[PDB]
């Protein structure tokens, strides 16, 4: 077939698309995460949005994935978390179903990434000492 180039689907337009396609609009979702009765319905909500964004950024940073939207890690994929093969993951399923499936193993994975990052920092410090 023929084509002209990529198209723009919107803020959450790639929600129903597969993971491979949805991974090409990560910046699109990322960039809108920061932006006397009505007036005080803004000050307290803006603060909450800021706290959520900074929580996400800190959580990324303590893994070594700072300033990155796709980040590979040294933590092996424990198959107990999920048994699906990649072929049926990145081409025949969306991210909402994935978040539905893996909702139980989030915090342990986060802690594993944290400790792996700390080990990496210590190893780098040891290596640069020589």
């Amino acid at each position, epitope marked *: 077939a*023929v084509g*002209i180039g990529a198209v723009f689907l919107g803020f959450l337009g790639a929600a129903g698309s597969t993971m491979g396609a949805a991974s090409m609009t990560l910046t699109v979702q990322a960039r809108n995460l920061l932006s006397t009765v009505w007036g005080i319905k803004q000050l307290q909500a803006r603060v909450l949005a800021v706290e959520r964004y900074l929580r996400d950024q800190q959580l990324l940073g303590i893994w070594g994935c700072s300033g990155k939207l796709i980040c590979c890690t040294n933590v092996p994929w424990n198959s107990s978390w999920s048994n699906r093969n990649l072929s049926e993951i990145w081409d025949n399923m969306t991210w909402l179903q994935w978040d539905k499936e893996i909702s139980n193993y989030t915090q342990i994975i986060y802690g594993l990434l944290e400790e792996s990052q700390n080990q990496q920092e210590k190893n780098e410090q040891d290596l640069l000492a020589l």
Partner: antibody
Amino acid sequence: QKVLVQSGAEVKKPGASVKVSCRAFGYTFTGNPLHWVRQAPGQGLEWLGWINPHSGDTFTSQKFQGRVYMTRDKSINTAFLDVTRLTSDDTGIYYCARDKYYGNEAVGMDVWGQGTSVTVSS
Amino acid sequence: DIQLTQSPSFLSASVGDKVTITCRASQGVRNELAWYQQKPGKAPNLLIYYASTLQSGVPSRFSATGSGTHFTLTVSSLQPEDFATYFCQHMSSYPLTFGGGTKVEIK
């Protein structure tokens, strides 16, 4: 919900210029490309080109280059086709069609406008 | 350009009968084909994309098969509102072109 609406019918003298509009409803205007086709009275469908509203890039058929131009306005979700140097052979119904465009490649036009009738005579 | 021919140009059949219409392309297109239905003086509608998949909302009686240069559209059980012009169009390489036109008429 996906709908395309054009302007009214046009009657022009030969050698003039005609502007056919096409506005989209029910889907993200920048999320799909737009084909521009025409069907002459009692004939088949002739394909002029297609435009990518997001990047603004266009393609025109090799038999229409330098004669027909294509533009879009994202602020109003509209696509404009400008045909210059009209002749009696240009009469017919002009359609603007949304391509399915799965996989960033042409697949098929599934949503069509009501069709703008353009006539050319002395 | 890529020449796209249809056969038969005109056909006669009754309700309940089967109609098979042949698309042929001068050059080879793998699955870059689409089948359309256009009624008199009305906007066309898509029937098949990828030469083997029905468009959403299309009746299941429609079916199509073929790869390369030869393609066929089959209406398994003809219906009263199935009488219209049929088109077969390629998009493998520029320019996109439509078929000559096949008209199904009642008997």
